[PDB]
């Protein structure tokens, strides 16, 4: 127990039912997140948070490098894997703190500052993720924070991205036996899916002379976002006057760090018939476990080649067609929607950047846990929503930020927490 | 600023946040719609409006013809293309006025009357769209209007089709580079998709003697609705005792005027094996930009033919199978749901029918605009919803129509607007 | 007499002192503006207003043409030329009405609609001046108006663009005798000048083979705004390895209709020395009387040529340098700042578009009129400003527009004018 | 939203309209400033702030050196370049914090103290900029601060330098196409220009014997200030009895660090005629982009030389004449007017000096942004100004400083911020 507003503004307090109209028998839980990330050779890095993620995914750590590129480090998660025990969930509140806790055994460099912003969009949508670039990702003053000393730390508060949302299904494993030992079956978050429609080519003319092994072109590359399962569908129709051409095609899903996270054969070894229409369907389904880090983009590669060939080939074809990437439950707010970036720099190489937080949820147990876990509709307390609405409404005057300098936030935890001690 | 009810009942007033439980940081906007449509040779025509469309599509103009058929004229849209600047949106209120403004340089014919109704369904669902046919599309007296003088004009008011709806994603373009110059990548409205399942045939027997070029049959034709992207999936399995038959199949998407709006090859040039099962998959994905006018139906054509053939063929096969048309975000209310028809007749050929309106939305800026556009949760003012509920509840006693004679509506704009002048 | 708010919201009422802190002995005046513009062959046209212009310039009329170009018609002014009788001035309020009053002797075509917007910028800054393009020039709903019947008309209200502004000096003629009969001497509006700095070229390389008469290139072309006097200054330095090159340069000031409004020789017939630096100064001063229509842009043309020349010239030079266009009193708000466009279309060719309005000012008489005109500081009435501030503050809720459908505006003239009848 | 006083005294709070009489439709924005400056070999440096700068320029960093000279490091700016999105602006409030965040990897030297003052004049007007020299730049006790520990930090608060000021035009780029790729066209801040009139010489006699290449003298050197565009005009008349003398002249604009920031040829290679008057005009126009660091002075150099010459020359001339340097919008308060210096010393070489702040403005969007950005007159709340006046009036008793020890300032953020938490 704790009035929803208390939990909303100070999640470390514990959970409370969200006072909206979504009346479902459920249970409440608090999940911690503790990490001791290590600073890289550059002393700069980036932590990406999914403030409203309806599940155990909290964020991911990337380190910046000499080449100015990022290198995925690891995913930031919940103390326990919710999908393992519950099937449905809803985020009530969340709070996290990035802050350094060490100093290499050979340094006294207070070194370290932090910049943080809350982008109203998906990771791939950011137009600039440099330390200082972040500062202008939003126009909202209460969603930024500049040069906070790393020692002091920063606090990330998760304000609501909408209420009266339904429950999300965690990527819980459904019962299933198979021949393959590594076979996985799960019921994924589907509701409110995101769809990206890509018109790869509209009668695009291709041509290059022969080549042993074939010539390869990257037809397109688009920015998409995904943390959980998605699927590509659609079809590409090819036409050619040439004889004996064998097309090969592969789709790639690239991580935030430029790394290829997933690769699939849309159609390898395909023979093109002169004159007739050559259909090349897409039937991709990428499961969650295969997505080892956030997907920032997708690209299509086509490797054209001919059965014989000399210097005489001048291989050529024409392609028309569009695809449709569908990331399940992608449009459920907070699932991919708001991203909070916490960038640090000048931090002593090797020093630790400690992350600690709490996530509160409304959950529905899986068949097994449901036998010992009682569920109930939320406690009823009038005007709880109105007050929330009022609060949020007057959010900026009240100074309720999403990214706070831990000190300021701490003083707020009395500046409206000096009642019921 | 303007109490939601003021905006709801008089949209020309400006926007206001919807007082529901969907708490999201957003921005408010008003978009105008101005058109000067020209009357055809018949002096009769039809304007189709999508009252609750969550975006820049307001409606479409069709002109009636001698053959008694309609001819699509053009789409009615918002002053600016929202998907270009915002990614998510929600309609707050909308108001439009159809009314004549001219008279050919050789006429003094007051000529012109208007009939209008608000159908609780998709365009294709209308059982009669004739001038007088409309009058009985709904049983609600406050959703009809008969023989309003065209000079006087009519006003279309957009009442809520549900509240607490989430944001819709506009067909905004996602970042992407490709080889084709005319390559398009966008993130479409997906949430609350509409699905039509069509069982094309259940062991349907086909047979006709040979024919040079082949014989062609239209397997089925069904009414579906679509304004934005959709996709057809499924599969048809064929069986045949005959040898060397090559099946060809194409899908058509027809406009409201009978015109073919889109055509795709589901599978052209396919060879049927005697005895074995012959699978014919569907992997269609129709992007929005390709839909030049509302889609009222879909049909499948199969062209069967044999490799040799004389008078000896008696080509025959059997097909089983069902498809599944999915129009993304189709079931989000107002996306396709309520259609308001404004039919006019007896209007002087060549005279202008002027359309003017305002659409108010709650919007979320795209990554670029988000750097100068601040967003906030809606202003909190208690009892705003209740009053709305009350108002709507007592909607018919209060005489709040969706289609008004501009005069009556004008007097209502004082009959409940004579406060705060 | 009339409370400033009465005058502000209903200028046809008469003048009143502005209740700000600019305490100067002055006099009050109302000036009418009556015009009967004639509709062109296209039936479409554009009227440009300078709502806050501190003087006798009200606007200008342009007619659209087949080639889709505009043709300046004439300037819209005050009943009398203020600069002739006063030296200083300040605009208190202004109101204007565009509306058709005729119908060719061979037509009964109600034909005609109007679109109007108030752009927060100079004329040249508009990114689209088409009939429908205007509709999205501002995001403010109360600064647009769509498809108003031309017969009904539109009313342009002039809201304040800032208060506590000083007096502007009218282009009044100063005493002066000269040898030239057409010699003119005046004291212009200077305060708050606008400055445009143009870096024409930074070591720009030029080269083309000989040519009798020379080869001519347009170095640059930029958008600037001016209605009254301006002046170009600066300098271009040239370098050349070639011998005997004679450069010629001219500056053009182009009207809104593409027409050249003014042309001046920055430096015609100039000999370039090989090796040394060749300075080409600008000392232009364009007086008001020479500006026959609003200046939308400026461009520089350089005609290079050689003393001898065959096919052997390969004339070439390099130029570095920037100019500085200074439009006197250009940044005084309303002097060029807000432009209100009133576009009409479908209007019967030959029909009259009547313009009528009133402008109220605070004025200081010239030496001669000052002998019979008594001046006084404004009448003091407490809270006049606050109420104004309050009103303007709550401007959008109150529905106070800058462009109104004359009918609505008329009803407002009671909806807040039903007191003191 | 936030009462102007809250924003004024605690800018990190957000923007609010200034409650003065300058009524203009506008928009409000907060811009951050984050920098991690590095301490030089001397451990001492100087940060120069322009507290009231009406735009994106916040200040500039200089490092002190062994030779006791400063070396410009870089300009301190706003998170985003305002001139890129807005055309007009007005500063509401500003707050900045200089403070160290590191310590070299080989030190434990708390080392570091700060001195800060707010000079009521331009940078070039300071009579002493040494660490301790600053302490006596003002007599106001609340505009100084001595030996604040660098670790603790200092806070720079921006008090009003006048109200009821008009909007300033940002150096926004005006539309323009040219032959040179690096051609730039912009509309600069002009209103309230500063003018320096320099009488270079009044019949100054010059004479020196011949010299190959010529003899060069620096005619004059004066202190002027400029951060944005300026222009030099005027003329020098020369007289000589000698024959065949070719004068060359160049103007230099020197930075705060003694470095030449800009150099221009006023007139290179000029032949002096014996007896007649020899005019040497100035037509300089220095654009903003060329000013890479604040200009602290200007000087004129004249290189006299003769066509022939042996030991026989005794070159001599006489010059009369005065120039007029005009820095556009230079006298708009805060544009150059008050400078706040933050000097640090004894800081560990290599350690970081972190700068962080917020700037709040009232802005007018450029033509493009104006289509999605709504503007409004300021919110009206009575007595807001009076209270301000009262506050400022009693400024010293209340202890409202412009330079605070971050600790004291922090406690003030409760000592008058313990209301509305």
Swiss-Prot record, chains A, B, C, D:
It is found in: Virion; Host cytoplasm. It comes from the Viruses. A divalent metal cation binds at residue 20. Homotrimer. A central divalent metal stabilizes the VP2 trimer. Interacts with host ITGA4/ITGB1. This is Capsid protein VP2. It comes from Avian infectious bursal disease virus (strain Cu-1).
